[PDB]
Design a binder for these strands. Sequence first.
RNA 1: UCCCAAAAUGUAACGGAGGCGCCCAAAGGUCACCUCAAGACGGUUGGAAAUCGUCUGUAGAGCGCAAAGGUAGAAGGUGG
RNA 2: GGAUGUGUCGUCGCAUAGACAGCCAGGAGGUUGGCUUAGAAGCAGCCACCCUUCAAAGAGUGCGUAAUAGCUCACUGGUC
Lengths: 63, 37, 136, 175
Amino acid sequence: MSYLIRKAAGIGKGSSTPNKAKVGKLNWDQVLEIAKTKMPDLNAGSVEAAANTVAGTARSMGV
Amino acid sequence: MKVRSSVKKMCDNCKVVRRHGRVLVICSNVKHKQRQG
Amino acid sequence: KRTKFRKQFRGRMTGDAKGGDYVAFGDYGLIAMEPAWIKSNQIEACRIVMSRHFRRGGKIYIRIFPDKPVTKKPAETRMGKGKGAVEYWVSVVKPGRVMFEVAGVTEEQAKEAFRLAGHKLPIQTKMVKREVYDEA
Amino acid sequence: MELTAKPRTPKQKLDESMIAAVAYNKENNVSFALDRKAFDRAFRQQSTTGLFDITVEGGETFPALVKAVQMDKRKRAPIHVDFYMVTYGEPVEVSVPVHTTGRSQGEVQGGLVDIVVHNLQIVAPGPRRIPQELVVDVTKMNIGDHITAGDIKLPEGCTLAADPELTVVSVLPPR
RNA sequence: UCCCAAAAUGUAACGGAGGCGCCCAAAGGUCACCUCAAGACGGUUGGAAAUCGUCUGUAGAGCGCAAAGGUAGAAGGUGG
RNA sequence: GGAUGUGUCGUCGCAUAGACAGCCAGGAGGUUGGCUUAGAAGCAGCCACCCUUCAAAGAGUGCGUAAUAGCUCACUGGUC
Ligand SMILES: [Mg+2]
Ligand SMILES: [Mg+2]
Ligand SMILES: [Mg+2]
Ligand SMILES: [Mg+2]
């Protein structure tokens, strides 16, 4: 899903030090299209159960 | 068979076996066969 | 490591520990159980290994500066007076003396640094914890 | 801590598990002698900011507060301890240590949180209400932020002792 | 003269530092009289020190030279 | 310096509300984390150690390959 984030937020690369300097910030609207295209690749529950999954990745990516 | 006066653990398979007045260590890994004698 | 300007020469003698607490400037520390002399290069070695083990931190406290000039044997003979003006300096260490202390790292991350330094000391040592509160 | 005999000769103390202790205030100054284990179990908790019930052999419960301990060298086991019988209004000044709760905003960034002074002595602790700990905010700190005793909340009814501009905690830079 | 010298004194070594082989018609005698170094504040050929003034100041100065002891009620500095 | 050699005191935690070792069985979906590099996806180093489902599975210990794989451990249940 990192590709989709590197496109939506327009990220050239990322961040070597996510603890110091970050990259950017998006919105939840750009997350709905992520849990809608990659459905079979997620066995979550409903709504929030799939909204907190992706948010996780982003958290350590630098968003 | 590496003779070391200081035999200590190096993994989680090393087992110290006291023999006839001698310090030996058994292990699945044959590179971990240390012995004071 | 070495002093910046002193007198020159000295003597030699060991009495019981005097001014070494347990917990000073940090959480964990390392003490002597044996009375000896600590060459400066030994300190340097300790400090350095400790640095290797602690990539970032710089919270290594070393309060045992070497203030003892030791002489040395030029070549041979014995005709002539005070020899070897500059050989090395020492830091007398008596049991109870706190040589090294560090803070910030976990439990396992102290046994390691300490354990290593310890293989560079001419005497046994031990690691302690906080529990003593004398003067503050 | 059930206190028993209390002589002056440590002949029947060194052998057994007993530690020589004393207590005073302003009136009586009779020397005691408490158990090793009992103390090593109790001083671990209340430390120097908490009194404990001290019943002397016969039926004499006298409340006291630990003041100065003279532990032994070469060993971790103490050898002498000084007690202070708390009065009621204004006893002696007690030393209260400084803990730290919550992750700082400078530890994440790369720096480290460093307490410059562990123990901090204040004025007029107030009996029955002695501060056993001290909670100081650390999250408000960043990089190079200095927090003095003018920034530490008072446990209500307690005034400071050290200079107002003394650095208690400071977040040092990495390396 | 210190240190070694291990608290009377004394005590060695090709042990550890540093001085003397002088000087002063005044630096003597006596009688009077004055009080230092240093920092801060503020001032003009200064902008480190100093010259001045007001405070603080058991002397952190001085005593011809080396050092220790000693010295503020002087063995510090001047005059008849 | 090193070690299940023994004897004797003590500091921490785990109890049939069924450990621990062993055995049988399962082991992630996000994910091929971000970053740096020809490449390094638990396992060179910089960073974190967030989320969900669940009786439950730490982006994680060792061995490995040019990276992949695989073989396991933490954890869960059952049989004594
Ligand atoms: Mg001797
Ligand atoms: Mg004498
Ligand atoms: Mg004598
Ligand atoms: Mg003689």
